[PDB]
């Protein structure tokens, strides 16, 4: 339904068409000659003089052609850079899951799908986005028997009475046991130590 979502490819095609069209239209220009048609300026004139007009037309057209070539070169360099980036996305997001933030989609990446398009590629990025937050209460470390315990993997939270360990991107509570905690020294240095069992 929604159009104008494919602005880049349409813009590329329009740019190429405009460049070609203006290059063609440059034929009709005079460039200071007496006319823009070779046959008429050849017929109406004589030998040693029309040469100057033909030279003017020739050099003008040659300059226009060189300008067109240079523009083509610049655009080609840009498209090459874009295609290098596209190949990179093809290689490391389609053929594997990516870790670099915000390279393939907004949020934590899951996968990608490629689809063709007249002069390019379309990536469907499947990502992950959380929602429905809360607060709870935090303490950097939990010391039992005077010695600290840090969580092997997760973070400490509490709902007011019971403390729990969870992971970082999904609310999931678990009771605390040695299986997911490891000790380091005694709780006298860390700022935020709270009692528990």
């Amino acid at each position: 339904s929604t159009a104008s979502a494919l602005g880049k490819l349409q813009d590329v095609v329009n740019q190429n068409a405009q460049a070609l069209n203006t290059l063609v239209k440059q034929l009709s220009s005079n460039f200071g000659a007496i006319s823009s048609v070779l046959n008429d300026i050849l017929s109406r004139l004589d030998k040693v003089e029309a040469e100057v007009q033909i030279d003017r037309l020739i050099t003008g057209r040659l300059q226009s052609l060189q300008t067109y070539v240079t523009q083509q070169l610049i655009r080609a360099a840009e498209i090459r850079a874009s295609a290098n980036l596209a190949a990179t996305k093809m290689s490391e997001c389609v053929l594997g899951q990516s870790k670099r933030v915000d390279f393939c989609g907004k949020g934590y990446h899951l996968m990608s799908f490629p689809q063709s398009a007249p002069h390019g590629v379309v990536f469907l990025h499947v990502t992950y986005v959380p929602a429905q937050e809360k607060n709870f209460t935090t303490a950097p470390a939990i010391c039992h028997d005077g010695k600290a315990h840090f969580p092997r993997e997760g973070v400490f939270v509490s709902n007011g009475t019971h403390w729990f360990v969870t992971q970082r991107n999904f609310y999931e509570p678990q009771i605390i046991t040695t299986d997911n905690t490891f000790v380091s020294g005694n709780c006298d240095v860390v700022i935020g130590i709270v009692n528990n069992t």
């Binding site: 979502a5 494919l6 880049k8 490819l9 590329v12 190429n16 070609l20 020739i58 057209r61 040659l62 052609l65 083509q72 655009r75 080609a76 498209i79 874009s82 295609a83 980036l85 596209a86 996305k89 989609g105 907004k106 949020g107 899951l110 398009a117 002069h119 390019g120 590629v121 379309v122 990536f123 469907l124 990025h125 499947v126 990502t127 992950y128 986005v129 959380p130 929602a131 429905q132 937050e133 809360k134 607060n135 709870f136 209460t137 935090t138 303490a139 973070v155 939270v157 969870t166 970082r168 991107n169 999904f170 609310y171 935020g192």
Partner: protein, 84 residues
Amino acid sequence: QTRAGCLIGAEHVNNSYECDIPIGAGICASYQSIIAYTMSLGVENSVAYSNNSIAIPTNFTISVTTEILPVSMTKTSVDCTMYI
């Protein structure tokens, strides 16, 4: 009169919206009698920061987005004698 020059046909207001036609020097316009005003960077909120509070998500969503990348253009060739 603004920093970038002046507008004729527009009427200034003191509101703030995320505009669509950038004018310049922060000023930008919208239709709504054409109006021009100061753009709003966005709805400003303050995180209730403290040293003992976190915010753990309890649900998730999966969103499928799209992006488009050109990879090539048309291949063109041009003569010299035929053209010039």
